[PDB]
Design a protein around this ligand. Structure first.
Ligand SMILES: Cc1cc2nc3c(=O)[nH]c(=O)nc-3n(C[C@H](O)[C@H](O)[C@H](O)COP(=O)(O)O)c2cc1C
Length: 358
């Protein structure tokens, strides 16, 4: 079984290739990690398994969802440590994903009622909505096109957050540069309409993610930094003329950062919008570990690793309804269906840790 052939990811010896994709669950009440999170990850932690946490705020402006966790305050760090310990107790590797939603926010999630920051002033279209604290759907407001100096301050938030993540005990961090959020708002030419050093040409559009990746590498080391991107996705009006070209531009800058740093990154993570060729082109271009995600199943994951299309495969949806997805895949057991209705609720058990095992 290819998915169970050991894999060496930096200084981490993984026992299998089943990775936990980052998934927002809104159980971190008031943005503070809760005991529920400890059980949730513990139930699904496995010896030599790699897990990626839900997106975590890097500033009081990095939120666009309700009750999402953070790593910018000493309180949050204290609670994450308790969670990290339970995950390590079971022998799993866990990376903390730093998440800034950019323009994908709302006044209710912006301290002082200020508009969410982004690369452009164009708001996400009406066909997309945001989850409000009371469960209703809200309209995305007009964002503010940040100045060159604030980009440096956002980058600083990633750096400080990565350091905070290490203080909490995480084995590393993952940069959330996909699904139309802040970093993706700079990468996609359908959004980035800047006329300065960060807009226009692909090289300019990729500058932001480059500075962010460089900042975290200089804080905790490239071996403990993963990068997630999505060259072709329509989420929150994040489109690009040539998705492949954009993906290859990011990959090219990641390979260069590794050469200049003298160490490879932890991995490259690309989510699919499920041609096949888009994924294979980046994997062949990236000099390092490649993780694939999006619409993968037990059979589809095995084929990707056996054919050399990816080194690790992360599962999202199937790891919500299947706490023991790793074991199930090993035995080819039936997989449980998920109830989307409880994806973003606040119940510490119902739809979170109540899913039956084998
Ligand atoms: C409820 C839910 C929350 C998610 N949260 C995030 C997130 O916070 N960050 C992210 O990059 N992707 C997030 N995703 C996308 C998943 O990481 C993944 O790409 C998707 O679930 C595809 O999984 P699959 O391969 O099992 O079909 C989320 C998906 C779901 C269903």
């Amino acid at each position: 079984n290819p998915l169970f052939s050991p894999y060496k990811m930096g200084k981490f010896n993984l026992s299998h290739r089943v990775v936990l994709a980052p998934m927002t669950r809104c159980r971190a009440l008031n943005n503070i990690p809760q005991a529920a999170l400890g059980e949730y990850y513990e139930q699904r932690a496995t010896a030599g398994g790699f897990l990626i946490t839900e997106g975590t705020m890097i500033s009081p402006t990095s939120a666009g969802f309700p009750h999402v966790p953070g790593i910018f305050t000493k309180e949050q760090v204290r609670e994450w440590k308790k969670i990290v310990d339970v995950v390590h107790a079971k022998g799993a590797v866990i990376f903390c994903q730093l998440w800034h939603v950019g323009r994908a926010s709302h006044e209710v999630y912006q301290p002082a009622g200020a508009a969410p920051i982004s690369s452009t002033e164009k708001p996400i279209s009406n066909r997309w909505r945001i989850l409000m604290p009371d469960g209703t759907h809200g309209i995305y407001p007009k964002p503010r096109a940040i100045g060159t100096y604030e980009i440096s301050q956002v980058v600083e938030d990633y750096r400080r957050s990565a350091l905070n993540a290490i203080e909490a005990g995480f084995d590393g961090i993952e940069i959330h540069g996909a699904h139309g959020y802040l970093i993706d708002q700079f990468l996609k030419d359908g959004i980035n309409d800047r006329t300065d050093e960060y807009g226009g040409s692909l090289a300019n559009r990729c500058k932001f993610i480059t500075q962010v990746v460089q900042a975290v590498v200089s804080a905790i080391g490239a071996d403990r930094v993963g990068v997630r991107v999505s060259p072709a996705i329509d989420h929150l009006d994040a489109m690009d003329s040539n998705p492949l070209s954009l993906g290859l531009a990011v990959v090219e800058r990641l390979n260069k950062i590794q050469l200049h740093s003298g160490s490879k990154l932890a991995y490259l993570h690309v989510t699919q919008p499920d041609e096949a060729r888009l994924m294979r082109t980046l994997r062949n271009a990236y000099q390092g570990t490649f993780i694939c995600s999006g619409g993968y199943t037990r059979e589809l994951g095995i084929e990707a690793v056996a054919q050399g299309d990816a080194d690790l495969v992360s599962y999202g949806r199937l790891f919500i309804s299947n706490p023991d997805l790793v074991m199930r895949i090993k035995l080819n057991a039936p997989l449980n269906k998920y109830n989307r209705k409880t994806f973003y609720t606040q119940d510490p058990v119902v739809g979170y840790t109540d899913y039956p095992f084998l």
